[PDB]
Every structure is written in structure tokens, then in C-alpha cells.
């Protein structure tokens, strides 16, 4: 899923 949080 591209729009999952890509942060810590």
C-alpha cells in the first residue's frame, strides 16, 4: 500500500 505512513 503506497499510502501507508512511510515514517517512523
Amino acid at each position, epitope marked *: 500500500n*503506497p*499510502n*501507508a*505512513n*512511510p*515514517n*517512523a
Partner: antibody
Amino acid sequence: QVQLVESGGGVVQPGSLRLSCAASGFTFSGYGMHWVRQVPGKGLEWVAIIWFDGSQKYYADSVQGRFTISRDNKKTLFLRMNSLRAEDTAVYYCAKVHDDEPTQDYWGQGTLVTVFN
Amino acid sequence: IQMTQSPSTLSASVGDRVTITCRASQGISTSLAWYQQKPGKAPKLLIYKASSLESGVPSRFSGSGSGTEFTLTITSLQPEDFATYYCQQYKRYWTFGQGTKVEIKR
């Protein structure tokens, strides 16, 4: 002090180029980053995103298998542009992802990419 | 998912109340952001989650709406607010509206 300095833009042939994005003022290793391009006189179009990890790469339908997104947590974001097509002439912005919601908050100054046929 | 803004352009004076609307195809709940961009400059985030104000943004900017329709409101328009405004969804990938250019009335 969140700063995004872009570089690497220029003119090429229908060629290869690599844009840089030097992040400062925040822990670059903990956030994901974006590349968004804007055709002069037109709106905004997203290009690529990678996690803080480097594990999940996702590109738009138009730059798949040509541009590649990378990062050297040198605290710099890269986009190696290869096999440049005509429709890729735009100002390229690197952008940071917000804390709460997964969208862009801070944007780079943007460097121009021009593809002369 | 594509975003349609209304109007595309509008003229206003300093101190006016201006309103920008954004209609999304398919519901996006509150996964909407508003951006500001002046010519030759990078866009700046004003509103996220439809109504949450980004830090540093002046209090005269506010967002509303949920589902498919959304509204950016600017109270007491300032000379530095003449610019183009974009709405954006971040439910599936990232899609922007066509932009609304706020121009100076005379």
C-alpha cells in the same frame, strides 16, 4: 530549520540525469520523502515515494522503469532520471511527509529538467 | 480519484472573506490537504486532514468538509495571500485539483 536544497537539474537529450535533495533541520532518517513535478503552466503531478526504510518503492504509471528513487541517510534524497521522454519536462520538487497524515508538508526549491528533442 | 476546484479564478480585495471549494471523485473522508503556491516558488502546506492547521500558518486560513466536498476559507485577505491554491487527496496516491488563482480586484 527544515530546509530542502535541490540540485542536479539541467538539459539532456531524449539521456540520464540525477537530482539531489539535501535535507536539514529535521531527522531525515525518520521520515519518508516525495518527488513531485510541475509542468510550467500546469498543475502538480506526483512521481515517486520511498519509506524512511528504503523498503517500499512506489512510482507513478508514467515514470515506472525509468526514474529510480533512493536515499543515503548523507541525509540526501535522489532521483536518477534515465530514458528521459519529452513529457517529463517539469520543475521537480522533493517533499517531506507529514507526521500524522501521509502527505507532503515541506517542499524543496525545485530544479528544472528540460528534455530537448 | 480526481479533484475539481471551484472557481478556477476569482478577484478580491484586501480584507475580504474568500472561499474555495473542492469536490472529490469517490469519498476520501478527511484525507484532504490545501496548498498555496506563488509563481516560481514551491507550494506550501496550509491545511491537512481537511481542517487541521499546519504550524506557522496564519490563523485566517481554515478548512472544512468531509467525504467529497471541502472548503478553504480565508478571513481578511492579506496582500501576501494573492496566490494559487490547490486541494489534494491522499487516500489513494496523491491527486491535486486544478488550482484556484486569487487575483487583485480593481
